[PDB]
Write a protein that binds this ligand. Structure first.
Ligand SMILES: Cn1cc(-c2ccccc2)nc1COc1ncc(C2CC2)nc1C(=O)N[C@H]1CCOC1
Ligand SMILES: [Mg+2]
Ligand SMILES: [Zn+2]
Length: 313
């Protein structure tokens, strides 16, 4: 109870910033996550014995794939931490409990393939879940791990609070389906501009949390350039593996996933920043002003990809 997690000074300071990199020492990521829960939620939110056991079962159920791995889980949870800390009073005790856990669990048992590849492969998961295939699986895996003996980190919640938190976590994890992002941002855009957005309306909160989840999930584009650039390699390593698999099914993959079209990556980053990232962080800043640093950092990396195209790097 009187046991706080502390970090080294540089991590203590840098962890509060949106652009924080959790570093290459895997064995520190659990301590980093617990540190964030304790400062975001309270030392009382979770029974430390159960939290630690939940974290290590979650870690175990992430795979050794190049991008959608344990490091991504913790990076995405750190971005959510940054948002919750910079927007203290806007979120319930239950939302702070659910969203950090949601973020850690959001890509559980990811195989490094898109929903599209599961469907064209005719993977069993694509029959069980017709849309947001991987995302419903990630939630299913979260509920599985929550029901392991000793793993129920929400045991102190009432029946109805327990259901509220598993419902926050489910919508939060479904929202990481980037196909659901576009519509969700347009609705939030229209709602903000007409002045109809209302954070006491539960369906409005849901949309806002969904946008945060997109924001944290894409947060690789909000890092300092050398981090963003090096993460790009891991991202394309999955994309190109999937393209390879598409070719094995007899299907020309989209260029994004075709390793024969590496040359076009810088232009592909531009599209993604303009079509997805910038709109995402723009709308998020409108709703949550203190998240502006994510927009600024995103715009900085757009400018850096523009420099790559111009042959200046
Ligand atoms: C869009 N596009 C298109 C070409 C592209 C490249 C070469 C030739 C042609 C096109 N390259 C890109 C770049 O795509 C990304 N770049 C960076 C990141 C960061 C946030 C994680 N995510 C994505 C991305 O698409 N993330 C989506 C899809 C899977 O999970 C969610
Ligand atoms: Mg995902
Ligand atoms: Zn993700």
């Amino acid at each position: 109870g009187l046991m706080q997690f502390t970090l080294p000074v540089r991590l203590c300071k840098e962890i509060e910033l949106f652009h924080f990199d959790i570093g290459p020492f895997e064995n520190m990521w659990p301590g980093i996550f617990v540190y964030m829960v304790h400062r975001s939620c309270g030392t009382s939110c979770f029974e430390l014995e159960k939290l630690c056991r939940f974290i290590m079962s979650v870690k175990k159920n992430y795979r050794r794939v190049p991008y959608h791995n344990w490091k991504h889980a913790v990076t995405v949870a750190h971005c959510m931490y940054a948002i919750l800390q910079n927007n203290h009073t806007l979120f319930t005790d239950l939302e702070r409990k659910g969203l950090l856990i949601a973020c850690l669990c959001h890509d559980l048992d990811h195989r490094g393939f898109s929903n599209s590849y599961l469907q064209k492969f005719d993977h069993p998961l694509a029959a069980l879940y017709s849309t947001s295939t991987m995302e419903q699986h990630h939630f299913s895996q979260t509920v599985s791990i929550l029901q392991l003996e000793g793993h129920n980190i929400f045991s102190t919640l009432s029946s109805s609070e327990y259901e509220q938190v598993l419902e926050i976590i489910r919508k939060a994890i479904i929202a990481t389906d980037l196909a659901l992002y576009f519509g969700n941002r347009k609705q939030l855009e229209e709602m903000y501009q007409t002045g109809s957005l209302n954070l006491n309306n539960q369906s409005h909160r849901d949309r806002v949390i969904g946008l945060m989840m997109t924001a944290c999930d894409l947060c690789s584009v909000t890092k300092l350039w050398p981090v963003t650039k090096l993460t790009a390699n891991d991202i394309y390593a999955e994309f190109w593996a999937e393209g390879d698999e598409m070719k094995k099914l007899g299907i020309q993959p989209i260029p994004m996933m075709d390793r024969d079209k590496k040359d076009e990556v810088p232009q592909g980053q531009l599209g993604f920043y303009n079509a997805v990232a910038i709109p995402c962080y723009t709308t998020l800043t409108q709703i949550l002003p203190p998240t502006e640093p994510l927009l600024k950092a995103c715009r900085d990396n757009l400018s850096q990809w523009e420099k790559v195209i111009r042959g200046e790097e």
